[PDB]
């Protein structure tokens, strides 16, 4: 039992995994088994969702988060996101669940039976954290792998059925992407967009051509970068900038993951393109706007002239101007005027919401959709009672957008905390005082008084 | 075919349970590692075969 | 009789499982019968 | 729902997602067995 107590390893049981830092075989084991756990959850959770799935209720009324991910890719769904075949969901679930067995088998093997260290066994699979070239090489393999992944998304979109497109002419539907956006001004133009209202950085991506082209760029970039890191070793400036240790690299990755988590939170909250409202429910903005729409429709049917209706504050009861003059829905939803969705856009002209189109061209499907979305707003309790906080029990509903956003904020935050922890520790340990101050060499004691 | 399916699938579940308990016990057991190792090869191979059998039979029962 | 025969880790595991079961029952009870809102 | 052929496994399918959590608790059973050394 090499290194499996505090006295020999220096780490207590509650930090026991830190005993693995220089044990590449067992560490490989931990990693592979963990990957196994992830894939296991994907499979099992998918089969659970499918078992509980009623094809004629919206997905979002049923607590689904993975089936929406599958349906977004174009599998199992048809016009307007209606389920036409549940078999691909079944396939996805079963295949992940079976793969998890292979992964776990490997993980357990390397973890308790295989070589505890790999260096003596193989120069190729062996590594020293402090070997910069080897680090950049493994990094490179993994970048090529990620690039390939992005390219698989591309291949699905272009050659194997396409993607679900909430924006398809005539109504949302599955669509093959034939002309992906390759122009770098567009692609990287997203990257330089402000993250504030009406701009929204990369979260603002609103068409699949841009999504797909973006993935072509990321695929090539990752493969190229992978090759670069396989062929090179870090330059002097990098060498002097970073800490080179396992715990350091881990901390860097924790920072990256935290950042990505906050990003995904905002994506699932605001974006209704790669997270179609057909599957995930309406966004908060969307449902608010939809309320406005619903009452405009009702009151106008009653005979109200909604363009000239002055509300109690002096602002339009139904319609008002944005700070730059565009015609928008009034009331509190004035905040959500940057919202865009296929059910609303046919009412939009060059200056914003168009009064003539409003008076003359609103179709029954728009009324239906606005009602649906208004009454599936992402508000609800921890015990999944749908609606505002004061609503009575009756409707069993918490929006998938809320589950995903909240979960990923919690995770992203704790991951920032973890970054601080491991970065600070990595610094202290590399400098040699992570276990405390040397009584015979206390740095402050050799410093001049502050006063 | 349906009965063959049902039996193959039950077989796969049972065998999986057997492997889930036995593989980590064998890996960490001091004595009798040779017979265990052989048995782990046998079990893994049979497991794969059963996955493929259920996979194929799926399309003749659903 | 003498302390030791039943290993402490097993006692902790069984006791813990028991705790999990009872609390589980209570959470089930939140969805069925009295207090369920139904 | 799962395809009819698999329906008999519904209770099993209901339980599977929680299995990962069982791995975390198993770390603690294991550690208790070696006295948290």
């Amino acid at each position: 039992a090499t290194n499996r107590d505090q006295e020999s390893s220096g780490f207590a049981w509650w930090a026991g995994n830190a005993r693995l830092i220089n044990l590449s075989g067992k560490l490989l084991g931990a990693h592979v088994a963990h990957a196994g756990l992830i894939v296991f959850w994907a499979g099992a959770m998918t089969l659970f969702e499918l078992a509980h799935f009623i094809p004629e209720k919206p997905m979002y009324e049923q607590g689904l988060i993975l089936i929406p991910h599958i349906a977004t890719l174009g599998w199992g769904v048809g016009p307007g996101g209606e389920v036409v075949d549940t078999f691909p969901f079944f396939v996805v679930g079963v295949v992940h669940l079976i793969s998890s067995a292979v992964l776990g088998f490997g993980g357990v093997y390397h973890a308790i039976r295989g070589p505890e260290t790999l260096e003596e066994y193989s120069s190729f699979f062996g590594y020293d954290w402090k070997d910069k070239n080897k680090m950049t090489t493994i990094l490179g393999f993994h970048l090529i792998v990620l690039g390939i992944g992005a390219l698989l998304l591309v291949a699905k979109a272009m050659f194997f059925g396409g993607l679900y497109d909430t924006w398809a002419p005539g109504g949302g539907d599955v669509r093959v992407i034939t002309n992906p956006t390759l122009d770098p001004r567009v692609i990287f133009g997203y990257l330089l967009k402000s993250p504030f209202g009406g701009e929204g950085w990369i979260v603002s991506v609103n068409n699949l051509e841009d999504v797909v082209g973006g993935h072509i760029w990321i695929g090539l970039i990752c493969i190229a970068g992978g090759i670069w890191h396989i062929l090179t070793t870090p330059f002097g400036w990098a060498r002097r900038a970073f800490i080179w240790s396992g715990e350091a690299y881990l901390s860097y990755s924790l920072g990256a993951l935290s950042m990505m988590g906050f990003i995904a939170t905002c994506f699932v909250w605001f974006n209704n393109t790669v997270y179609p409202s057909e599957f995930y429910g309406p966004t908060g903005p969307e449902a608010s706007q939809a309320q406005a729409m619903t009452f405009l429709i009702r009151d106008q049917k009653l005979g109200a002239n909604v363009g000239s209706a002055q509300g109690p504050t002096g602002l339009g009861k139904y319609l008002m101007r944005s700070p730059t003059g565009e015609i928008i829905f009034g009331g509190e939803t004035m905040r959500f005027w940057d919202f865009r969705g296929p059910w609303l856009e046919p009412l939009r002209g060059p200056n914003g919401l168009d009064l003539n189109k409003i008076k003359n061209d609103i179709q029954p499907w728009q009324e239906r959709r606005a009602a649906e979305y208004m009454t599936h707003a992402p508000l609800g309790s921890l015990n999944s009672v749908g609606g505002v906080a004061t609503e009575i029990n009756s409707v069993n509903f918490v929006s998938p957008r809320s589950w995903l956003a909240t979960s990923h904020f919690v995770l992203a935050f704790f991951f920032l905390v973890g970054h601080l922890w491991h970065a600070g520790r990595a610094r202290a340990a590399a400098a040699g005082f992570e276990k405390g101050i040397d009584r015979e060499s206390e740095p402050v004691l050799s410093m001049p008084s502050l006063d | 075919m349906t009965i063959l399916f049902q039996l193959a699938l039950a077989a796969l579940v049972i065998l999986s349970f057997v492997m889930v308990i036995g593989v980590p016990v064998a890996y960490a057991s001091p004595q009798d590692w040779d017979r265990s190792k052989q048995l782990i090869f046998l079990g893994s191979g049979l497991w794969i075969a059963l996955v493929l059998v259920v996979g194929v039979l799926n399309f003749f029962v659903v | 009789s003498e302390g030791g025969r039943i290993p402490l880790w097993i006692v902790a595991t069984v006791a813990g499982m028991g705790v999990i079961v009872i609390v589980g029952l209570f959470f089930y009870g939140a969805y069925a019968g009295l207090g369920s809102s139904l | 729902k799962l395809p009819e052929a698999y329906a008999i496994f519904d209770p099993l399918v209901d339980v599977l997602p929680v299995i990962p959590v069982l791995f975390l608790a198993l770390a603690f059973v294991w550690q208790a067995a070696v006295g948290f050394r």
Binding site: - | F17, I21, P30 | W9, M17 | D10, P11
Partner: peptide
């Protein structure tokens, strides 16, 4: 109902059973 509980019973016992078997066999815990 009893089915789900039965499943979680065997599945749930699986883990502690492994530790127990190795503890009895003086295995490499």
């Amino acid at each position: 109902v009893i089915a789900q509980l039965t499943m979680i019973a065997m599945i749930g016992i699986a883990g502690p059973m492994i530790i127990f078997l190795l503890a009895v066999r003086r295995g490499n815990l």
